[PDB]
Amino acid sequence: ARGPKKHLKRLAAPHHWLLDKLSGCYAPRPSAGPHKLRESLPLIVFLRNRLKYALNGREVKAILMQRHVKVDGKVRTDTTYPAGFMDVITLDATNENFRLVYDVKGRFAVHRITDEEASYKLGKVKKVQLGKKGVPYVVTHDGRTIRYPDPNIKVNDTVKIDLASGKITDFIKFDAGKLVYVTGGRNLGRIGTIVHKERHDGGFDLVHIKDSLDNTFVTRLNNVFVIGEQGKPYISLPKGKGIKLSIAEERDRRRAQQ
């Protein structure tokens, strides 16, 4: 190619979107934004294929141009805006608030939250550095640059950000025993507690996580997201609380409830 691409084939789209393979030939390409293309849920998919409020892309555009949708407290009018992990989506007309958190299966879930919980979000500190004029700042996983951070905040920590002011209200250090959420790999969507961080210089650090059922799994440090102390997450968790269940157990539960 001679420049950036602008089209996305349906078969090439992220699997977790759960798009019909025969509905069309193209899928919404997420516009540039806070979250990476493959880790993001464009607003069209959320409003149409998840909430079912809109029956087609044109109706999604009609909804957005009415300014009814806010992402992290700010109105967005782009159909393919890349909403992503820990993003608060507010619909005032419906009096509804959502937080985009993976379910255990590895797909963004329709998780409703309260207004108080919609006032803040969490962000993994991806970088900490001095800017111009010697003003320290932290860069989080959604591209937010926050100046004058608490000096104790280091990389891999999780900062609680207030959406109204975009200021750090609280922070959580990365340490053993902390409650974490897996945001990548085949263990995506699971919740557990750190046991041990294996450090390899010049390579990828691995973290061993123990879930509530005592199962243990190893994941790269890039996919880990601290969300609180054990049993006391800073956010309301989805149904199932991030616990993986074997196919037989899922069958048993499904038959029991049916």
């Binding site: 079912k52 409020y53 809109a54 109706e59 909804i63 009415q66 009814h68 619909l91 007309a93 419906t94």
Partner: protein, 130 residues
Amino acid sequence: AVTIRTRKVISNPLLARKQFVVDVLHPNRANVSKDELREKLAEVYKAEKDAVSVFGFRTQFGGGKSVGFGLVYNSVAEAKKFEPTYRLVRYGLAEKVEKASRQQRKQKKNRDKKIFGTGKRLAKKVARRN
């Protein structure tokens, strides 16, 4: 008789309407016209007939029942604002706009592309030349 049942009802204040799936039992009848379904749904939901849209009706194999989708807008103005133009044309709410075939418009576009400016100067120039 005919029985109309609305299922999977969703209230969409974003688009200011109510969506649902209309299941029509019509024993001893071929099928129900969209006009009659719109009138009956308007009577049920206490709305103007203009505010009711219905589409996508397929009669199940063997007859006797049909399934389609239905929308009930909060008032007529919102229906005119949000509804697709073609569906409005079906209901008579809007008049079909008459336009030339795509080939005619495309050829006219190319011919106009060949001209620069308003073209009146070219007209008077060719007139004086000949």
